[PDB]
Amino acid sequence: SKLLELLRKLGEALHKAIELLEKWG
Amino acid sequence: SKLLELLRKLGEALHKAIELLEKWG
Amino acid sequence: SKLLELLRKLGEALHKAIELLEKWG
Amino acid sequence: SKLLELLRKLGEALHKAIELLEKWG
Amino acid sequence: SKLLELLRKLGEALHKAIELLEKWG
Amino acid sequence: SKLLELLRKLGEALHKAIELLEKWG
Amino acid sequence: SKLLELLRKLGEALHKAIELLEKWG
Amino acid sequence: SKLLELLRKLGEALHKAIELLEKWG
Amino acid sequence: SKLLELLRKLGEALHKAIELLEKWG
Amino acid sequence: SKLLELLRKLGEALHKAIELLEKWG
Amino acid sequence: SKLLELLRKLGEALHKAIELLEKWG
Amino acid sequence: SKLLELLRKLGEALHKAIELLEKWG
Amino acid sequence: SKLLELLRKLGEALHKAIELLEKWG
Amino acid sequence: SKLLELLRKLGEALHKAIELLEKWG
Amino acid sequence: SKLLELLRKLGEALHKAIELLEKWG
Amino acid sequence: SKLLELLRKLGEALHKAIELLEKWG
Amino acid sequence: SKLLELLRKLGEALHKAIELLEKWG
């Protein structure tokens, strides 16, 4: 349950990282 | 360019997938 | 509702993946 | 490459089908 | 209306599938 | 080889019919 | 054999459309 | 116009269907 | 409206032709 | 007895087609 | 066999009739 | 000119119906 | 306008042959 | 409903076509 | 070979999607 | 439960698509 | 090919997420 929260948090970061890669790339 | 799109879509899908897993878990 | 949202995203990703396979193939 | 074309048409059909599902669900 | 677009695509896919069957057969 | 020709036409006819259904619907 | 099974579906499908085209037209 | 061309295709299909019936019969 | 009549007849035959072709094939 | 039917239907379709040709011609 | 020859010819006549309609339509 | 060939075909069809009739009658 | 009359007559005469063949067959 | 009926058929046909494409391919 | 597998999977997914559309529609 | 069945197939399909993209890319 | 590496990993993560969703769902 605390893991899941952590899991979700990464997912959000990875999502943003890819969006950024798009904009810059 | 077309690849980067595909990446974003997988990121969005993944991101969403984890959000659910949290709701159900 | 959230499961349908995820379903769509996977459809969009799969659609793009196939378009790319066409371009490269 | 005519197969790829076929594949691409199935992707779209599937994509549309899922979107309709979402609308009705 | 969105269902009718869905059909068109199934018709296009079926059409191509048969074209392939002709070429290979 | 001739049965494949027949199928092809039926596919083309079905495709035309669906296109009409769109325009009218 | 398979083709004949296939053929009969195209005919079946094609019929369905026309019956609709008649009603709408 | 779309209707007119739709018919043409049914005429071509029917023509070929009869040709087959001949060869097989 | 007289074209839809004709369409139906064309459909109506094509149906018969295919049914026979199935039995013989 | 199957082919007779088919014959009748071809005659019915041809009759309709000629009636148009008259009107349009 | 003789009957079939008649069927083919009716199919050919019907095919031309429809092609004619197209030209005028 | 396209009308003529349609006639020719109707003449050929009729000339073969009659021929059949003779065999049967 | 004189061939349309002729066309009709041929069609009328075909019909009658077809009817007869059905009764005898 | 009639459209939904139609929709199934397209799927049924398309399904048959794909199976065949697999066996031949 | 790989492509054909992908084809089958798209067919299976599309088939399932249509079955749902039937139930819900 | 049908949706989960459906969703497993999209994932399966996409996997293939990506595997191909790897090999060809 | 660096984004293909990245792609693969997103596919692997998404695959695992889906498997979990299946079990828990």
Place this chain on the structure above:
Amino acid sequence: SKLLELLRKLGEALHKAIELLEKWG
């Protein structure tokens, strides 16, 4: 234990994404 696999995969994907962001940025 099945979610720590998912965790690791998200960490690895995020690592790759950041390495790219470094280079391009």
